Design a protein around this nucleic acid. Sequence first.
DNA 1: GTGGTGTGTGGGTGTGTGTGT
DNA 2: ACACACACACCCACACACCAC
Lengths: 557, 242, 587
Amino acid sequence: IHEGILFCIELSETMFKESSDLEYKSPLLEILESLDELMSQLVITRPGTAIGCYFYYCNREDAKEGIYELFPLRDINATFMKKLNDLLEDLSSGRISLYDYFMFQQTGSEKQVRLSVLFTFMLDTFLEEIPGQKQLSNKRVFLFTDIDKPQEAQDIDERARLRRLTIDLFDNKVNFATFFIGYADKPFDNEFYSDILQLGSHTNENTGLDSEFDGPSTKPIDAKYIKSRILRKKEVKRIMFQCPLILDEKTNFIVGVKGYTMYTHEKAGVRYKLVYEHEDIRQEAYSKRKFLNPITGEDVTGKTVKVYPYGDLDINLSDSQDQIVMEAYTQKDAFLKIIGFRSSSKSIHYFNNIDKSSFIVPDEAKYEGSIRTLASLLKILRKKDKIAILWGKLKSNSHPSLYTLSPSSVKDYNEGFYLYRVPFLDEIRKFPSLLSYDDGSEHKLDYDNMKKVTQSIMGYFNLRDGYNPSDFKNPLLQKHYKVLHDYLLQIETTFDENETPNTKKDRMMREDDSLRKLYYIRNKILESEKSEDPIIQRLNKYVKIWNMFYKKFNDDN
Amino acid sequence: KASFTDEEDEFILDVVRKNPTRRTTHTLYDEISHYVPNHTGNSIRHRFRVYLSKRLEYVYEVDKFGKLVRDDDGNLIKTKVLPPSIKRKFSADEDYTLAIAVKKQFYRDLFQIDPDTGRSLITDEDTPTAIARRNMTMDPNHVPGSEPNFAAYRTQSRRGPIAREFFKHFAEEHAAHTENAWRDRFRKFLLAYGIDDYISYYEAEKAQNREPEPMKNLTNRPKRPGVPTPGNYNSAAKRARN
Amino acid sequence: SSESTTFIVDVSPSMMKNNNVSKSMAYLEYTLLNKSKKSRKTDWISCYLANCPVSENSQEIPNVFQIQSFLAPVTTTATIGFIKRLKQYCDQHSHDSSNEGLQSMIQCLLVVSLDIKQQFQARKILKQIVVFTDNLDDLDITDEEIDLLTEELSTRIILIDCGKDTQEERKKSNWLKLVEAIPNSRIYNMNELLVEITSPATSVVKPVRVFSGELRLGADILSTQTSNPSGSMQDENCLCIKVEAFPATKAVSGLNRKTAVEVEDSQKKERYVGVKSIIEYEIHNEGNKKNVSEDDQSGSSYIPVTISKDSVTKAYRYGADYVVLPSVLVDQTVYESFPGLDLRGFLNREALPRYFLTSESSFITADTRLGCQSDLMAFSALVDVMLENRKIAVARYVSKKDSEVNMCALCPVLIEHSNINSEKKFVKSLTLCRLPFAEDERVTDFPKLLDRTTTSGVPLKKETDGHQIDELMEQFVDSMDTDELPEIPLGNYYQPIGEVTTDTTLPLPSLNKDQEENKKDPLRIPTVFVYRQQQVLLEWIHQLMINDSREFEIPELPDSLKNKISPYTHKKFDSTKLVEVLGIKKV
DNA sequence: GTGGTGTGTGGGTGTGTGTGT
DNA sequence: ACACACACACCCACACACCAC
């Protein structure tokens, strides 16, 4: 549930300098902006995350032995976002430069911190658990640096000491997440950090294999990808289900499977707390479901029996009878059974979704030889477009369904299967009873002209990039959490209803990301009208022709 | 939102109390939903019917002349008796009376005699006074001839003539409600059911000391499918008022 | 509308010895227990016995018995009583008082017609008589008899042919004259009815409109995002079509259960009444002080306290801060949206990943009850061109003014209609499913699968050998291939209510013959848990109340249901060697 | 004179949603 | 997934009306 991130950023003369990679944006400024965006997103997605940020080597008097604590390892707080946004505002307005803030004088021979004290501080930070906040379930360190060859790199004995410290960190469950930065004009050497941060995975002769885990991925990332890497590394794997996949029943050809929800439904205000406000003392108020006898009125919760009402008759099936009745098609625990493989052109449809899909990945902690089986199955399912029709329930307390295990394409970075759910015959609703059915088919010429005109319009608004969820923030959640944020910081809330048409429109597109693109569509239509060039003047002419065809038909019939 | 904010319940309860003659209607709740920023007429009517109908208690005084009703000072009086609806339901006695009236009118049209006794008369030297009512004389009774007068008369396959005068006279003599309701009741229920059939059914049920049910489920006319329903009070409208 | 059904079960020894009376009793039990779960006040039933050995009738006519008078609403207790009464009559009159030959069954029809005309003299009520007779070519209803019968009956006859045997040719007569004379009269074989009542029953949920607004492309955001009496047609250089949205694929809950408390009874039987749920709020007073001692003495206390809902406020969460919003800001914490479908762009079907779709499906169709047929042409042309170019459209979807804002994908789909004419005239409509937002995406990075590498990125060991692994798995996937089962055609996936509505709530083998041989689709299977518990309840009622049994004898799930939820078999194949070479061992 | 159609009501029922376990 | 309470859509037989040839 909880998680502790620890932003550790190493300071260098190049980091302060703006790079042409980010179009004259400093890598340190990019990291700070990524931190701000990450905290803003996490206060909505996952408020339980704990975040801290430390800089080094800096000359601040506040810096305890060379490490500067922008904000400690604490739970997400609005005060820290306000502090970081003040920092960003000072950087943007030019009030204080990064060099002035961090007191980093450009000499070309600036001192550096020794990694031993850095790693001990990393270990000690996760040890000083705050009494006012809950324990850390997951621990991470977001390591940013640009100096690939520190002083300790030359030595080999202190390399062993650093390895010992790294082993202690891993034993304390503090996994690393490296962000080593390399430039086009300056590549990044990976030997030292790879040497220290890995366990030394070596094959264990002919008496079996060794541990699959070896250490963090120390591959350098270009400065172009700093923000994209930070923002997509903040998410924790939220396991939905783990149910055995019984490919063949009789021969016990059964493997383990893990299930992760690719997407969810984020709601505006489900996270709250019922508060009993009595004068000045505020405390929690809990809600209970008290059951009442409609005859006597007694509190009957805890002494009720479930019965099946058919007509004016209640059928009291006991526990054993319910157990036997249910077991005709499903067991007590979650499972998924391979029923049959089918082509992908007859099973995956875009007009029959009933639920959000899940990501299936092997699980070898309960059934050995699952990764091999599912890797071979994934290889086979693609290169001849097919699926796996499944049958089971993903939760112990749920109802079975027939799914369509589909293999991920080679485009997606993630390797695994997607588990769509096929609607039952009951769930497939019926098309309504329309009040007219002679749309345009009998009028061949008018219908042909109108549909060719609508086809012409459609070609103008083709989405080259395709749908990207990151481009669309949820307007309700954005407004709700913005109100929360600016109330917590005593920032005046914006309210006005006498706005000019120019500024009200700007506010509407600022609050809604989709409205920006809708205004872009409207502007694209408008510009085709005003422009004198014939190659672009076609869009407004097509729209006007469509609007004339629209007006004609309600008169003819 | 998506609640009813008890002050809102009291507001709509008071609005219903102001018009007790429209408590079960459908337009009143549409107007309320127009005035209330939230909730639709269907939702408001359901809320009142299920929950707030138990807390009506009293309705502000309403008379035929008029609404509302105040005292000498100008205060609002609250009464515990709810005025009847705007659509008066029909009963067995009303249907029986209508059937008897139509049967007697049809019998008069053909045999020129009105049950039970009197016969037609024409003025020669002395008049029967007012000519608006029937010029009838009871003296030549009982007649020596044998006639089906009147219970033996069979009225099937007869549908007129009736005209507007007969129904105006019926509504006046019976001192009953509007003529259009009687005309529609007659044409749509009695004729499609049978005047003699209902007469015999009512008489038989009365003989066996049982209450006969009035005519029911005799629509006889289509609901006109293919056109919008006459009256919609859903989230679509929500009509604009001025 | 209002409907009434009447049942006539032949008791003559041809039925009794052939056990067709048991089939009739089972069918009546199913139909009446189906009618009881609704208990409509306008659903009349009445059962007679024809060619009965002992006759009791309201009109003093022999060989005619009314074993059950007219009943409405049908109830489970009444159904059980009537069914066990008919069973007792059958048991008592099976051998010692069995009739001979075939009596006059026409007399029963006249009495039933008279009773129907007594109960429903002139009401516009659908009256129905469903007779069960074992002989059609044997009983003789002459021309005068059929003429008088069709003069008497304005009601339809559903005659069930309980006696059918194999033969190189089938010929019938006599009974067809009465069926032909009376319109809407039908004839079925009883085994077909038994098969129909054995099959699961599909839901018949009425299509209720969800959204009503405009599908606008390029509409000005100033004239569409404002509370206005007029719609988006304030500009004349945009595209606007009035559409409405109905559910298309909604999840089904399990069979309804009720929590109840046992109460008293006349014979100390079981009577259950549903409880009422009231919400109640409480606080915990943390007074828990314990006195010190030199032993195990550590007594203390911990009790809650109930407080009203009036003095309770929501404290929203922002990171580590739980704050309560002032009244004015609560009005500001909600996004004020407006209904409508705003098109963002058109992308190819494969350019939208299938896992993006995140909610239940919905229909989009031109509004015909509040718009014009110009909307119909515009919508149909848009759907047709989207289908022709294989396009999906992403749109900003707000159903109603207070609802959330969604980004949704519009998929063009055709739907097949029988129509009044023989021409099928495919109906064009879009299908709407919502796409995720920025905050919805939970995509992480997982370890690679095909060519495994360590966490640091160096390649992993190639194990022993993978040459045979993929060949054996390939044979496994060809073993269970279901490509021989045809898929439902493009257009018949969604069927309109007009193809499923029936004038009578009686289980019949139906006339829609297109759905036959199109259930081979391995992916479209009937709901199985709901039908399983429905069948279990039906069998519980039957055994434990009608047959007076003592121990429940839970039935087996039918092989028709088990077939679609059990492994398929196209080519015979053994996976034991593949298991051995894949090294699978449960831990 | 009489048939045809139209609105709105009186008493509901059906379907979808939210919340606590 | 689950039951119960609640919000909103939908219905329809029919009193009550008006209009037209």
